[PDB]
Amino acid sequence: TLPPLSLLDPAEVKQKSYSPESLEAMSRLLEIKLKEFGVEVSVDSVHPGPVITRFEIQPAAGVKVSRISNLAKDLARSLAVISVRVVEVIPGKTTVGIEIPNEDRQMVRFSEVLSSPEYDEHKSTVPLALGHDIGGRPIITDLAKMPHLLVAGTTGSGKSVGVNAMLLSILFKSTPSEARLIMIDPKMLELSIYEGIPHLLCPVVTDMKEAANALRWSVAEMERRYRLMAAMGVRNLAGFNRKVKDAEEAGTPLTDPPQLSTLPTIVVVVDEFADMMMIVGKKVEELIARIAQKARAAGIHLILATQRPSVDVITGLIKANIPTRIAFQVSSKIDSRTILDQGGAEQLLGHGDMLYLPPGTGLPIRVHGAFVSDDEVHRVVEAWKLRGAPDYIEDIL
Amino acid sequence: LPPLSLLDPAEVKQKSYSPESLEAMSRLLEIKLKEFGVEVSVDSVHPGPVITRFEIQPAAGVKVSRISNLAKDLARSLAVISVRVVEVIPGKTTVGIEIPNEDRQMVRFSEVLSSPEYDEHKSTVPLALGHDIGGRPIITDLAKMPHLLVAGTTGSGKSVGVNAMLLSILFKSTPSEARLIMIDPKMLELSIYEGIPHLLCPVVTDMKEAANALRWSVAEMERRYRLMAAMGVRNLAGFNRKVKDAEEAGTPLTDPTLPTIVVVVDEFADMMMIVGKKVEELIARIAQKARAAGIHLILATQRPSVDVITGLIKANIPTRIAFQVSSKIDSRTILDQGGAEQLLGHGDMLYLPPGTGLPIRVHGAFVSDDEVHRVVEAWKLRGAPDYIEDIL
Amino acid sequence: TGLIKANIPTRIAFQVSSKIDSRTILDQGGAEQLLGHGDMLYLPPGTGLPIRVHGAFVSDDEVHRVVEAWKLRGAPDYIEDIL
DNA sequence: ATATATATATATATATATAT
DNA sequence: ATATATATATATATATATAT
Numbered sequence: 001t002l003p004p005l006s007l008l009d010p011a012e013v014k015q016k017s018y019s020p021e022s023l024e025a026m027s028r029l030l031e032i033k034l035k036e037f038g039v040e041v042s043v044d045s046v047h048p049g050p051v052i053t054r055f056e057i058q059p060a061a062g063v064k065v066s067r068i069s070n071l072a073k074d075l076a077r078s079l080a081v082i083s084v085r086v087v088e089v090i091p092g093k094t095t096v097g098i099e100i101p102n103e104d105r106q107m108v109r110f111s112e113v114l115s116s117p118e119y120d121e122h123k124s125t126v127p128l129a130l131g132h133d134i135g136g137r138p139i140i141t142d143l144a145k146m147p148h149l150l151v152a153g154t155t156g157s158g159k160s161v162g163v164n165a166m167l168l169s170i171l172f173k174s175t176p177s178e179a180r181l182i183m184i185d186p187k188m189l190e191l192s193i194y195e196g197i198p199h200l201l202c203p204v205v206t207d208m209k210e211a212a213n214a215l216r217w218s219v220a221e222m223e224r225r226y227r228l229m230a231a232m233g234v235r236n237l238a239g240f241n242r243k244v245k246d247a248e249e250a251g252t253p254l255t256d257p258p259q260l261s262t263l264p265t266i267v268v269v270v271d272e273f274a275d276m277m278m279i280v281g282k283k284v285e286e287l288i289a290r291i292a293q294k295a296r297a298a299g300i301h302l303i304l305a306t307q308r309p310s311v312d313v314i315t316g317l318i319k320a321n322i323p324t325r326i327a328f329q330v331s332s333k334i335d336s337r338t339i340l341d342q343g344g345a346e347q348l349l350g351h352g353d354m355l356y357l358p359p360g361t362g363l364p365i366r367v368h369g370a371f372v373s374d375d376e377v378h379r380v381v382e383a384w385k386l387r388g389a390p391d392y393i394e395d396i397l
Numbered sequence: 398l399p400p401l402s403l404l405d406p407a408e409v410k411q412k413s414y415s416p417e418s419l420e421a422m423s424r425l426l427e428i429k430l431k432e433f434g435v436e437v438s439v440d441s442v443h444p445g446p447v448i449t450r451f452e453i454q455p456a457a458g459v460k461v462s463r464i465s466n467l468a469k470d471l472a473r474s475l476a477v478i479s480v481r482v483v484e485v486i487p488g489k490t491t492v493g494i495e496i497p498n499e500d501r502q503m504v505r506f507s508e509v510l511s512s513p514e515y516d517e518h519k520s521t522v523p524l525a526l527g528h529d530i531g532g533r534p535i536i537t538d539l540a541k542m543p544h545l546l547v548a549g550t551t552g553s554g555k556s557v558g559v560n561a562m563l564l565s566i567l568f569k570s571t572p573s574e575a576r577l578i579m580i581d582p583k584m585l586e587l588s589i590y591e592g593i594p595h596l597l598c599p600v601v602t603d604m605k606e607a608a609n610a611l612r613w614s615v616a617e618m619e620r621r622y623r624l625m626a627a628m629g630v631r632n633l634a635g636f637n638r639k640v641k642d643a644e645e646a647g648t649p650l651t652d653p654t655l656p657t658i659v660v661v662v663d664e665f666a667d668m669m670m671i672v673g674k675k676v677e678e679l680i681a682r683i684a685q686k687a688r689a690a691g692i693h694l695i696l697a698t699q700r701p702s703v704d705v706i707t708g709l710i711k712a713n714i715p716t717r718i719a720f721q722v723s724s725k726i727d728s729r730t731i732l733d734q735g736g737a738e739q740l741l742g743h744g745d746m747l748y749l750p751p752g753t754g755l756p757i758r759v760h761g762a763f764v765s766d767d768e769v770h771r772v773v774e775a776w777k778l779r780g781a782p783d784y785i786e787d788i789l
Numbered sequence: 790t791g792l793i794k795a796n797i798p799t800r801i802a803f804q805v806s807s808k809i810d811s812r813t814i815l816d817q818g819g820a821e822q823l824l825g826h827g828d829m830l831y832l833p834p835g836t837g838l839p840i841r842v843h844g845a846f847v848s849d850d851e852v853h854r855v856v857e858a859w860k861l862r863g864a865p866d867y868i869e870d871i872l
Numbered sequence: 873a874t875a876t877a878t879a880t881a882t883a884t885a886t887a888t889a890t891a892t
Numbered sequence: 893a894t895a896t897a898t899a900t901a902t903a904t905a906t907a908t909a910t911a912t
């Protein structure tokens with residue numbers, strides 16, 4: 001009874017297209033305005049895209065890539081653009097990629113992302129339709145193996161819309177028997193509108209006295225599920241669901257060290273982690289650390305939307321266990337490496353232009369975050385409440 | 398309402414610049430840059446009230462950082478206080494240097510209200526806080542900020558800035574829409590406001606009488622927030638939709654027009670220290686849902702320290718205004734960038750929008766305390782005050 | 790303390806022994822470069838650049854003379870309930 | 873133009889010195 | 893007795909500002 005994708009707004013902005021004459025002219029202009037800075041290049045390919053256009057240049061014989069990155073602001077100021085991003089390492093090809101933003105920004109809608117094959121047949125209970133890559137290819141990842149996340153970026157750069165797109169990716173694919181959310185929300189403006197779905201376990205947790213109890217129940221559920229899985233000769237949640245479905249195949253509900261069924265995939269979401277720490281502090285610090293360390297094999301996954309994550313806010317022991325991190329628009333090369341261990345997250349655009357950093361890879365996949373206005377979230381949540389009852393667990397609080 | 402013909406009519410100045418003066422200054426800028434390393438060609442000039450912008454076309458190979466570092470030696474070599482380099486102006490190729498004038502002209506408040514946006518501003522709490530570089534008024538809506546973080550080192554137009562903000566709040570409102578509860582610790586500012594119907598109590602000048610008004614504000618926001626759900630509406634305009642259509646259809650809608658109430662918080666460092674924590678962790682309570690029930694704050698202080706503007710108060714209010722501050726140390730706790738102390742003073746600010754990260758150079762408006770007395774007396778003469786007992 | 794620096798806009802620092810003390814007083818860092826013996830930089834009411842004011846010398850063989858010139862003209866008036 | 877030298881921001885780890 | 897706040901040393905990353 002999963003909702004129809006028709007509840008999302010249609011693809012409209014597909015009208016944009018640039019003639020190859022303009023690309024020729026702009027590539028020659030790029031070569032000239034670089035050669036005016038000492039570095040000579042040769043535009044090799046002109047790979048276009050929705051928001052940016054990767055002018056894949058071939059550096060000369062002897063020029064260093066740093067001699068290009070250190071002028072990624074002068075070159076931008078001298079091309080009548082906002083800010084160019086220099087992809088100092090293309091994977092596979094022996095080039096440097098300059099990504100000059102377009103004039104009219106083809107917006108990305110969310111039905112454009114979900115209608116893609118990578119989402120059609122993504123066999124995980126918890127996918128995440130992040131958006132389109134720099135060329136229109138959709139980027140769809142798996143929070144189940146991710147296994148956690150750290151949203152960041154300054155004010156007005158698309159963090160709330162990012163979390164919204166992620167949650168809607170959770171909804172259009174997973175029943176309450178395959179996913180089950182838990183949401184904390186200090187400074188409530190955009191997450192309250194999710195209340196009532198059959199995927200929650202609590203109200204929208206604004207009572208910071210009750211956030212601690214929610215996360216303590218989360219840790220307790222982690223412990224209980226580890227006990228229950230270790231008593232059944234398995235090594236993670238996926239193998240446990242395999243065993244229970246093979247049991248139901250033989251029509252035999254297994255023991256309960258009566259009956260056991262498939263277990264959900266908890267998703268603990270936290271918006272603006274800094275405001276939560278400014279209230280609960282050390283009381284819910286060991287809790288986040290302990291639900292981030294040993295809560296992958298169980299299923300309790302942890303999203304953490306935040307502004308600039310510093311060790312003052314998100315401690316090192318928590319960041320050292322959340323290895324997949326996105327960044328929308330930091331302010332400098334230190335606000336960048338606080339969230340992404342690199343630079344270049346300041347050389348972006350607002351309005352939802354993230355840098356997805358896959359787990360265990362030093363190359364941020366620049367992704368354009370899908371746009372989801374609150375009307376879409378409302379027309380999805382009100383359609384969920386029609387399908388299920390607000391199943392809550394007061395025992396959590 | 399008190400009409401526009403109650404303020405000082407903006408004195409007519411012929412000008413502070415001539416085309417030959419701008420041309421000579423542009424040539425001087427090019428020559429003083431050529432004496433340095435850079436090579437520069439000025440193409441366009443944009444005059445302004447206080448700061449004048451020179452959009453320069455740097456030569457092929459000139460890195461912007463070089464001019465941004467030569468900023469101070471330009472300030473010296475041009476015989477000015479200090480200039481600032483707008484490193485990237487949108488949609489162009491020219492770097493913008495901003496040179497202070499020699500004949501400052503004042504931003505008089507009638508010149509700010511008579512602007513076409515204040516008259517057309519569709520709200521009840523506009524903070525018409527003066528012109529910008531170009532000389533175009535910068536009017537913002539309180540209910541969308543939805544709170545404020547005015548600060549700046551002493552003698553930076555702060556009392557006058559807050560007075561202009563409050564006069565803007567007043568000038569286009571009645572007690573049925575806007576309403577005020579002022580907090581003036583130092584016995585110094587806002588003591589003039591005593592008899593306007595926009596007040597709910599005698600101006601809270603005692604400091605242990607301030608926790609009372611604060612607790613009443615909390616109770617008021619949290620009872621309006623329940624009264625909303627009693628009709629399913631969300632914002633105060635929504636709850637007003639009923640009672641202003643209950644007169645278009647004659648509807649007896651009862652207790653199952655509430656006005657916006659702007660708690661005017663001034664020099665809150667005092668209130669902080671003479672109360673303690675029951676005020677330190679109470680504005681953080683208000684700011685959460687006050688933005689939906691008319692309650693609003695104008696949090697202002699005259700020393701932005703680390704223990705006065707705390708992360709428990711700072712993070713619930715993203716809209717923040719500076720003035721000429723001591724140095725970068727207070728710049729980083731009243732704003733989040735660099736250049737909030739290098740302001741020409743006497744009203745200049747860096748307004749930071751709610752959903753932006755670039756503060757706009759804004760020239761504050763100057764309001765004569767004579768005209769403040771005049772307009773407060775005008776309000777006292779139009780209607781009459783009305784207070785409430787439990788405010789304590 | 791923060792309480793003392795809170796509501797005292799006007800400050801006067803003679804030559805302090807280091808720079809941390811100069812920031813403790815003025816928040817400027819220019820008090821440690823004073824030539825001693827009554828030299829001081831005045832941070833005027835309000836704020837701004839600290840003006841340097843070489844203090845004036847008065848000798849304890851003159852404070853006593855002035856105390857005498859006053860004492861002869863009046864008498865100690867100690868309001869009882871102060872202490 | 874390109875290799876170093878000096879200042880600064882951020883994060884870790886330790887020793888004191890305060891408070892509960 | 894046992895948690896915080898501060899100052900320090902040290903290690904990276906980043907620009908500017910001098911040598912060759």
Ligand SMILES: Nc1ncnc2c1ncn2[C@@H]1O[C@H](COP(=O)(O)OP(=O)(O)O)[C@@H](O)[C@H]1O
Binds near residue numbers: 153156157159
């Ligand atoms: N995918 C997108 N495309 C275009 N604009 C977007 C997109 N995502 C977000 N925005 C813009 O960003 C704003 C929301 O930013 P937000 O996530 O609230 O930042 P913050 O939470 O830091 O204030 C919206 O006003 C919207 O216009």
Ligand SMILES: Nc1ncnc2c1ncn2[C@@H]1O[C@H](COP(=O)(O)OP(=O)(O)O)[C@@H](O)[C@H]1O
Binds near residue numbers: 553554699
């Ligand atoms: N926009 C302006 N135009 C002219 N003079 C101004 C302006 N803003 C401030 N001033 C001058 O600065 C003074 C305001 O000082 P203020 O910053 O209120 O002191 P404090 O910070 O101690 O309250 C006014 O008396 C006025 O003379």
Ligand SMILES: Nc1ncnc2c1ncn2[C@@H]1O[C@H](COP(=O)(O)OP(=O)(O)O)[C@@H](O)[C@H]1O
Binds near residue numbers: 827843847
């Ligand atoms: N105007 C002045 N010129 C030169 N020396 C001065 C002046 N004023 C004070 N002094 C010096 O200051 C000294 C007194 O300082 P002192 O009272 O010992 O300081 P403290 O009591 O704070 O330790 C005198 O020895 C005198 O020489």
Ligand SMILES: [Mg+2]
Binds near residue numbers: 159160190
């Ligand atoms: Mg947000």
